[PDB]
Coordinates of C-alpha atoms and ligand atoms in Angstrom, one line a residue:
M1 CA 37.9 -150.8 -21.7
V2 CA 40.5 -148.1 -22.4
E3 CA 42.9 -146.7 -19.8
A4 CA 44.9 -143.5 -20.3
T5 CA 47.7 -142.5 -18.0
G6 CA 49.9 -139.4 -17.8
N7 CA 50.2 -135.9 -16.3
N8 CA 47.0 -133.8 -16.8
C9 CA 45.3 -136.3 -19.1
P10 CA 42.4 -134.7 -21.0
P11 CA 39.1 -136.5 -20.2
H12 CA 37.6 -138.8 -22.8
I13 CA 34.6 -137.7 -25.0
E14 CA 31.3 -139.5 -25.7
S15 CA 30.5 -138.0 -29.2
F16 CA 32.4 -136.3 -32.0
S17 CA 30.6 -133.0 -31.2
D18 CA 32.1 -133.0 -27.7
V19 CA 35.2 -131.4 -29.2
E20 CA 34.9 -128.7 -31.7
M21 CA 36.3 -130.2 -34.9
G22 CA 34.6 -127.8 -37.2
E23 CA 32.2 -128.0 -40.1
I24 CA 34.5 -129.7 -42.7
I25 CA 35.4 -132.6 -40.3
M26 CA 31.8 -132.9 -39.0
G27 CA 30.4 -133.0 -42.6
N28 CA 33.0 -135.5 -43.6
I29 CA 32.2 -137.7 -40.6
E30 CA 28.6 -137.8 -41.8
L31 CA 29.7 -138.8 -45.3
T32 CA 31.9 -141.5 -43.7
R33 CA 28.8 -142.6 -41.7
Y34 CA 30.6 -142.9 -38.4
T35 CA 27.9 -142.3 -35.8
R36 CA 30.0 -142.4 -32.5
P37 CA 33.6 -142.6 -31.6
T38 CA 35.1 -146.0 -30.9
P39 CA 36.7 -146.6 -27.5
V40 CA 40.2 -145.7 -28.7
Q41 CA 38.8 -142.6 -30.4
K42 CA 37.0 -141.5 -27.3
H43 CA 40.4 -141.2 -25.5
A44 CA 42.8 -140.4 -28.3
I45 CA 40.8 -137.6 -30.0
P46 CA 40.8 -135.2 -27.0
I47 CA 44.4 -136.1 -26.2
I48 CA 45.5 -135.1 -29.7
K49 CA 43.2 -132.1 -29.8
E50 CA 44.8 -130.9 -26.6
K51 CA 48.2 -131.2 -28.5
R52 CA 49.5 -134.0 -26.2
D53 CA 51.9 -136.7 -27.4
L54 CA 50.4 -140.2 -27.4
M55 CA 51.7 -143.7 -27.0
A56 CA 48.7 -145.9 -27.9
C57 CA 48.6 -149.7 -27.6
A58 CA 45.8 -150.5 -29.9
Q59 CA 45.3 -152.7 -33.0
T60 CA 43.3 -152.7 -36.3
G61 CA 39.5 -153.0 -35.7
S62 CA 40.1 -150.3 -33.0
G63 CA 39.3 -147.3 -35.3
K64 CA 42.9 -146.1 -34.5
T65 CA 43.3 -144.5 -38.0
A66 CA 40.5 -142.0 -37.6
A67 CA 41.6 -141.5 -33.9
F68 CA 44.7 -139.8 -35.3
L69 CA 43.5 -138.4 -38.7
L70 CA 40.4 -136.6 -37.3
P71 CA 42.1 -134.4 -34.7
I72 CA 45.2 -133.8 -36.8
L73 CA 43.3 -132.6 -39.9
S74 CA 41.0 -130.6 -37.5
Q75 CA 44.0 -128.7 -36.1
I76 CA 45.5 -128.2 -39.6
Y77 CA 42.1 -126.6 -40.7
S78 CA 41.8 -124.6 -37.5
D79 CA 45.3 -123.3 -37.3
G80 CA 47.6 -124.6 -40.1
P81 CA 50.5 -122.5 -41.6
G82 CA 49.6 -119.3 -43.4
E83 CA 48.9 -120.0 -47.1
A84 CA 50.9 -117.1 -48.8
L85 CA 54.0 -117.2 -46.5
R86 CA 54.1 -121.0 -47.0
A87 CA 54.0 -120.6 -50.8
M88 CA 56.9 -118.2 -50.7
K89 CA 58.9 -120.8 -48.7
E90 CA 58.1 -123.8 -51.0
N91 CA 58.4 -122.2 -54.4
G92 CA 61.8 -122.9 -55.9
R93 CA 63.6 -122.0 -59.1
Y94 CA 61.4 -124.6 -60.9
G95 CA 58.2 -124.1 -59.0
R96 CA 57.1 -126.5 -56.2
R97 CA 59.3 -129.5 -57.0
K98 CA 59.9 -130.4 -53.4
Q99 CA 57.0 -130.8 -51.0
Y100 CA 56.9 -129.9 -47.3
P101 CA 54.2 -132.1 -45.5
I102 CA 52.6 -130.6 -42.5
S103 CA 51.9 -134.1 -41.2
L104 CA 53.8 -137.3 -41.8
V105 CA 52.3 -140.8 -41.1
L106 CA 54.8 -143.7 -41.3
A107 CA 53.5 -147.2 -41.9
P108 CA 55.1 -150.7 -42.4
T109 CA 53.7 -151.8 -45.8
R110 CA 52.1 -150.6 -49.0
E111 CA 48.8 -152.1 -48.0
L112 CA 48.7 -150.3 -44.7
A113 CA 49.9 -147.0 -46.1
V114 CA 47.1 -147.1 -48.8
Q115 CA 44.4 -147.8 -46.2
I116 CA 45.5 -144.8 -44.1
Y117 CA 45.7 -142.7 -47.3
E118 CA 42.1 -143.7 -48.3
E119 CA 40.8 -142.9 -44.8
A120 CA 42.6 -139.5 -45.0
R121 CA 40.9 -138.6 -48.3
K122 CA 37.5 -139.3 -46.6
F123 CA 38.4 -136.5 -44.1
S124 CA 40.4 -134.1 -46.3
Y125 CA 37.4 -133.7 -48.7
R126 CA 36.4 -130.1 -49.3
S127 CA 39.6 -128.9 -47.4
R128 CA 42.9 -127.3 -48.5
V129 CA 44.8 -130.5 -47.4
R130 CA 45.8 -132.9 -50.2
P131 CA 46.9 -136.2 -48.7
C132 CA 49.5 -138.3 -50.6
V133 CA 51.0 -141.9 -50.2
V134 CA 54.4 -143.3 -51.2
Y135 CA 55.6 -146.9 -50.8
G136 CA 58.3 -149.3 -51.9
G137 CA 57.8 -151.9 -54.7
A138 CA 56.3 -149.5 -57.2
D139 CA 57.5 -146.9 -59.8
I140 CA 59.0 -143.9 -58.0
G141 CA 58.6 -141.5 -61.0
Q142 CA 54.8 -142.0 -60.7
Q143 CA 55.0 -141.2 -57.0
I144 CA 57.1 -138.1 -57.5
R145 CA 54.6 -136.7 -60.1
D146 CA 51.9 -137.3 -57.5
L147 CA 53.8 -135.5 -54.7
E148 CA 54.1 -132.5 -57.0
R149 CA 50.2 -132.1 -57.0
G150 CA 50.4 -131.6 -53.2
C151 CA 51.0 -133.5 -49.9
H152 CA 50.0 -131.5 -46.9
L153 CA 49.6 -135.0 -45.3
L154 CA 52.1 -137.6 -46.5
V155 CA 51.6 -141.3 -45.7
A156 CA 54.8 -143.3 -46.3
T157 CA 56.8 -146.5 -45.8
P158 CA 60.1 -145.6 -44.3
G159 CA 62.5 -146.8 -47.0
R160 CA 60.6 -145.1 -49.8
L161 CA 60.5 -141.8 -47.8
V162 CA 64.3 -141.8 -47.3
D163 CA 64.7 -142.4 -51.0
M164 CA 62.3 -139.4 -51.7
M165 CA 64.3 -137.2 -49.2
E166 CA 67.7 -138.2 -50.7
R167 CA 66.2 -137.3 -54.2
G168 CA 65.2 -133.9 -52.7
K169 CA 61.4 -134.5 -53.3
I170 CA 60.3 -134.2 -49.7
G171 CA 61.4 -131.7 -47.0
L172 CA 60.5 -132.3 -43.3
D173 CA 61.3 -128.7 -42.1
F174 CA 57.7 -127.7 -41.4
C175 CA 56.4 -131.1 -40.4
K176 CA 54.4 -130.5 -37.3
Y177 CA 52.5 -133.9 -36.8
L178 CA 54.3 -137.3 -36.8
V179 CA 52.4 -140.5 -36.6
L180 CA 54.1 -143.9 -36.4
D181 CA 51.5 -146.6 -37.1
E182 CA 52.1 -150.3 -36.3
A183 CA 55.5 -149.1 -34.8
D184 CA 56.1 -152.7 -33.5
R185 CA 55.8 -154.2 -37.0
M186 CA 58.0 -151.4 -38.4
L187 CA 60.8 -152.4 -35.9
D188 CA 60.2 -156.1 -36.7
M189 CA 60.8 -155.3 -40.4
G190 CA 64.1 -153.6 -39.7
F191 CA 62.9 -150.1 -40.4
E192 CA 64.3 -148.5 -37.2
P193 CA 67.5 -147.2 -39.0
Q194 CA 65.3 -145.6 -41.7
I195 CA 62.9 -144.2 -39.0
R196 CA 65.8 -142.7 -37.1
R197 CA 67.2 -141.1 -40.3
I198 CA 63.7 -139.6 -41.1
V199 CA 63.1 -138.3 -37.6
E200 CA 66.4 -137.6 -35.9
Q201 CA 69.0 -137.0 -38.6
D202 CA 67.3 -134.6 -40.9
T203 CA 65.3 -131.4 -40.6
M204 CA 62.1 -132.6 -38.8
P205 CA 61.3 -130.3 -35.9
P206 CA 62.1 -132.0 -32.5
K207 CA 59.7 -133.4 -30.0
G208 CA 57.8 -130.8 -28.1
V209 CA 57.8 -128.6 -31.3
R210 CA 56.2 -131.3 -33.5
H211 CA 53.3 -133.3 -32.1
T212 CA 54.0 -137.1 -32.1
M213 CA 51.8 -140.1 -31.9
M214 CA 52.8 -143.8 -31.9
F215 CA 50.4 -146.8 -32.4
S216 CA 51.3 -150.4 -31.9
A217 CA 49.3 -153.6 -31.3
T218 CA 52.1 -154.7 -28.9
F219 CA 54.2 -152.9 -26.3
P220 CA 57.6 -154.6 -25.9
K221 CA 60.5 -152.7 -24.3
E222 CA 61.9 -151.6 -27.6
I223 CA 58.7 -149.7 -28.3
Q224 CA 58.7 -148.1 -24.8
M225 CA 62.3 -147.0 -25.5
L226 CA 61.3 -145.6 -28.9
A227 CA 58.4 -143.7 -27.2
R228 CA 60.9 -142.3 -24.6
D229 CA 63.1 -141.0 -27.4
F230 CA 60.4 -139.7 -29.8
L231 CA 57.6 -138.5 -27.5
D232 CA 57.4 -135.5 -25.2
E233 CA 55.3 -135.6 -21.9
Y234 CA 53.2 -138.3 -23.6
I235 CA 50.0 -140.1 -22.4
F236 CA 50.1 -143.9 -22.4
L237 CA 46.8 -145.3 -23.7
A238 CA 46.1 -149.1 -23.5
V239 CA 43.0 -150.7 -25.0
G240 CA 41.8 -153.9 -23.4
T241 CA 35.4 -160.9 -31.7
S242 CA 34.8 -161.0 -35.5
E243 CA 34.0 -164.4 -37.0
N244 CA 34.5 -166.8 -34.0
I245 CA 30.7 -166.4 -33.7
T246 CA 27.9 -168.7 -34.8
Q247 CA 24.9 -166.5 -35.4
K248 CA 21.3 -167.9 -35.2
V249 CA 18.3 -165.7 -36.1
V250 CA 14.9 -167.2 -35.3
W251 CA 11.3 -165.9 -35.7
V252 CA 9.8 -165.4 -32.3
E253 CA 6.5 -163.6 -31.5
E254 CA 6.6 -161.3 -28.4
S255 CA 4.4 -163.6 -26.3
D256 CA 6.8 -166.5 -27.1
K257 CA 10.2 -164.9 -26.3
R258 CA 10.2 -165.9 -22.6
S259 CA 9.5 -169.6 -23.4
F260 CA 12.0 -169.5 -26.3
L261 CA 14.5 -168.1 -23.8
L262 CA 13.9 -170.9 -21.2
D263 CA 14.6 -173.5 -23.8
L264 CA 17.9 -171.8 -24.8
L265 CA 18.9 -171.6 -21.1
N266 CA 17.9 -175.3 -20.5
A267 CA 20.3 -176.3 -23.4
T268 CA 23.1 -174.4 -21.5
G269 CA 25.6 -176.6 -19.6
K270 CA 28.7 -176.1 -17.5
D271 CA 29.5 -172.8 -16.2
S272 CA 28.7 -171.0 -19.5
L273 CA 28.0 -167.3 -19.1
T274 CA 25.0 -166.0 -20.9
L275 CA 24.4 -162.3 -21.8
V276 CA 20.8 -161.4 -22.5
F277 CA 20.0 -158.1 -24.1
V278 CA 16.6 -156.4 -23.8
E279 CA 15.4 -153.1 -25.1
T280 CA 14.3 -151.3 -21.9
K281 CA 15.0 -150.9 -18.2
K282 CA 11.5 -152.1 -17.4
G283 CA 12.1 -155.1 -19.7
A284 CA 15.3 -155.9 -17.8
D285 CA 13.7 -155.8 -14.3
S286 CA 10.7 -157.8 -15.5
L287 CA 12.7 -160.5 -17.2
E288 CA 15.2 -161.0 -14.3
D289 CA 12.0 -161.4 -12.1
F290 CA 10.5 -164.0 -14.4
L291 CA 13.8 -165.9 -14.5
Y292 CA 14.2 -165.8 -10.7
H293 CA 10.7 -167.1 -10.2
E294 CA 11.5 -169.8 -12.8
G295 CA 14.4 -171.0 -10.7
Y296 CA 17.3 -169.4 -12.8
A297 CA 20.2 -167.7 -11.1
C298 CA 20.6 -164.5 -13.1
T299 CA 21.2 -160.8 -12.4
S300 CA 20.6 -157.6 -14.3
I301 CA 22.1 -154.3 -15.2
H302 CA 20.6 -151.1 -16.5
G303 CA 21.0 -147.3 -16.4
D304 CA 18.8 -146.7 -13.3
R305 CA 20.9 -149.1 -11.2
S306 CA 23.3 -147.6 -8.6
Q307 CA 27.0 -148.1 -8.9
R308 CA 26.7 -150.6 -6.0
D309 CA 23.8 -152.6 -7.6
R310 CA 26.0 -152.8 -10.7
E311 CA 29.1 -154.0 -8.8
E312 CA 27.0 -156.6 -7.0
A313 CA 25.5 -157.8 -10.3
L314 CA 28.9 -158.1 -12.0
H315 CA 30.4 -159.9 -9.0
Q316 CA 27.7 -162.6 -9.2
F317 CA 28.0 -162.9 -13.0
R318 CA 31.8 -163.1 -12.9
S319 CA 31.9 -165.8 -10.2
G320 CA 29.1 -167.6 -12.1
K321 CA 26.9 -167.6 -9.0
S322 CA 24.4 -165.8 -11.4
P323 CA 25.7 -166.9 -14.9
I324 CA 22.9 -165.1 -16.7
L325 CA 23.2 -161.3 -17.1
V326 CA 20.2 -159.4 -18.3
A327 CA 21.2 -156.0 -19.7
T328 CA 20.2 -153.1 -21.9
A329 CA 23.0 -152.3 -24.4
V330 CA 23.6 -148.8 -23.1
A331 CA 24.2 -150.3 -19.6
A332 CA 26.7 -152.9 -20.9
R333 CA 28.9 -150.4 -22.9
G334 CA 32.2 -149.8 -21.1
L335 CA 32.3 -152.8 -18.7
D336 CA 34.5 -155.8 -18.9
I337 CA 32.5 -158.9 -20.0
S338 CA 34.5 -161.3 -22.2
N339 CA 34.0 -165.0 -21.4
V340 CA 30.4 -164.9 -22.5
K341 CA 29.7 -168.2 -24.3
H342 CA 26.3 -167.0 -25.5
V343 CA 24.8 -163.7 -26.4
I344 CA 21.0 -163.6 -26.7
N345 CA 19.2 -160.7 -28.4
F346 CA 15.9 -161.2 -26.6
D347 CA 15.1 -157.9 -28.4
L348 CA 17.0 -156.8 -31.4
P349 CA 18.2 -153.2 -31.7
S350 CA 17.1 -150.7 -34.4
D351 CA 20.6 -150.4 -36.0
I352 CA 22.9 -153.2 -37.3
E353 CA 25.8 -151.3 -35.8
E354 CA 24.4 -152.0 -32.3
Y355 CA 23.9 -155.6 -33.3
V356 CA 27.6 -156.0 -34.3
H357 CA 28.8 -154.6 -30.9
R358 CA 26.4 -156.7 -28.9
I359 CA 27.4 -160.0 -30.6
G360 CA 31.1 -159.0 -30.3
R361 CA 30.9 -159.9 -26.6
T362 CA 30.9 -163.6 -27.3
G363 CA 33.9 -165.7 -28.4
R364 CA 36.9 -163.4 -27.8
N365 CA 37.3 -168.9 -28.4
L366 CA 34.0 -170.5 -29.6
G367 CA 30.9 -168.2 -29.4
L368 CA 27.2 -168.2 -30.0
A369 CA 24.7 -165.3 -30.7
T370 CA 21.0 -166.1 -30.9
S371 CA 18.6 -163.3 -31.9
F372 CA 14.8 -163.2 -31.6
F373 CA 13.2 -161.5 -34.6
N374 CA 9.6 -160.5 -35.3
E375 CA 7.5 -157.8 -37.1
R376 CA 9.1 -155.1 -34.8
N377 CA 12.4 -155.7 -36.5
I378 CA 11.4 -155.4 -40.2
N379 CA 13.7 -152.3 -40.5
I380 CA 17.0 -154.2 -40.1
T381 CA 16.0 -157.0 -42.4
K382 CA 18.4 -156.1 -45.3
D383 CA 21.4 -155.1 -43.1
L384 CA 21.0 -158.3 -41.0
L385 CA 20.8 -160.4 -44.2
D386 CA 23.9 -158.6 -45.6
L387 CA 25.8 -159.3 -42.3
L388 CA 24.8 -163.0 -42.2
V389 CA 25.8 -163.6 -45.8
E390 CA 29.1 -161.8 -45.2
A391 CA 29.9 -163.9 -42.1
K392 CA 28.9 -167.1 -44.0
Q393 CA 26.2 -167.9 -41.5
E394 CA 22.8 -169.7 -41.9
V395 CA 20.4 -167.2 -43.5
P396 CA 16.7 -168.0 -42.5
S397 CA 14.8 -168.5 -45.7
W398 CA 12.0 -166.1 -44.4
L399 CA 14.7 -163.5 -44.0
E400 CA 15.8 -163.6 -47.6
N401 CA 12.2 -163.6 -48.6
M402 CA 11.3 -160.4 -46.6
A403 CA 14.4 -158.7 -47.8
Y404 CA 13.0 -158.4 -51.3
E405 CA 9.4 -157.5 -50.6
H406 CA 7.8 -154.5 -52.3
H407 CA 4.2 -154.9 -51.2
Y408 CA 3.9 -155.2 -47.4
Ligands
LIG1 N1 33.6 -144.2 -35.2 C1 33.5 -145.3 -36.1 N2 32.3 -145.9 -36.4 C2 32.2 -146.9 -37.3 N3 33.3 -147.5 -37.9 C3 34.5 -147.0 -37.7 C4 34.7 -145.8 -36.7 N4 36.1 -145.5 -36.7 C5 36.7 -146.4 -37.5 N5 35.8 -147.3 -38.1 C6 36.0 -148.4 -39.0 O1 36.7 -149.4 -38.3 C7 37.5 -150.2 -39.1 C8 38.9 -150.5 -38.5 O2 39.7 -149.2 -38.4 P1 41.2 -149.2 -38.0 O3 41.4 -149.8 -36.6 O4 41.4 -147.7 -38.1 O5 42.0 -150.1 -39.0 C9 37.6 -149.4 -40.5 O6 36.6 -150.0 -41.4 C10 37.0 -148.1 -40.1 O7 36.4 -147.4 -41.3

């Protein structure tokens, strides 16, 4: 889970439409095919939309890039500087030869800057904002020519940005959004003097005028001290498994799933915790009852359970008194369940996205996900095949077969 702490902290959201980001952003989100905000996004988006400074301890895989880009671009579209007044300000003797970014994102490496820039383009599509990216280790002439086409949003490595500033190619006078991404890694690389020259020693509006966000995977003292210097009345956001997981997919008819489950639980040793996902609340109650009467210590959680029922279930699971948890996915979202050795998709979900999040509960090191598949699940065939192949897992032969069927 995610915790956010500070004075008057805006509450989190559940979906992108919970804040009014406008039609350009919302249409771009549909093109990007994000369906719901990740945990860091759920917190960071309303924080940024409310114009609050943010210190976020979060890493890659978080969705931290869109967590900052979405609300920043949204604000620029909603209430960015007036076009014509701004052109008067930026038009020199030779035309627009120096650019004045509304938003600056600092990043440690060319590879990270480029990723942030590519995500920005996904969200700046059909808007007035042209993002741009500059980085060390590549021809500067080329970058300067590109800046001249427009950077309302500039992504940059710190050394190359200082170079651009010294050359008079970039002005920070109107820069209203500053993001430091992987701030820890930037300090590790010795960029702090460059960052201080960018932020404190030139023309960037000071904290409380500009809006500032910092992201790092770690939070040492030096980062807390940078946050204190750079951030005004900020909120502290702390976020609490990829290929550590063996994935088994087996063909199981509905009337066979309980028996198949028993065999899986019989092969379980130790105190290994098992998470069993089912489709429905009824399904959860019914399966927990079957297991109890079969002599298994298990518990269950779903949406119609009280907060007390839920706390009691988690207590037994976490002590390992009842080392099998039966859950609907909607019920498991948000609660802390880590040391799961085995995730069982007793029923598969309709979307491969939900599949990925479910199996992400095991091996945060060794982990196992076993999924029961039948005719009800034809619709995820190709996406599941793509996922298995990508993770270098065993692909059932019948799955590759079904994947290419044009007759059934
Ligand atoms: N709401 C979302 N839904 C699905 N994928 C996302 C979402 N937000 C970010 N991502 C993806 O998550 C991955 C890691 O993002 P990041 O942590 O921003 O490096 C990238 O592939 C993003 O495109």
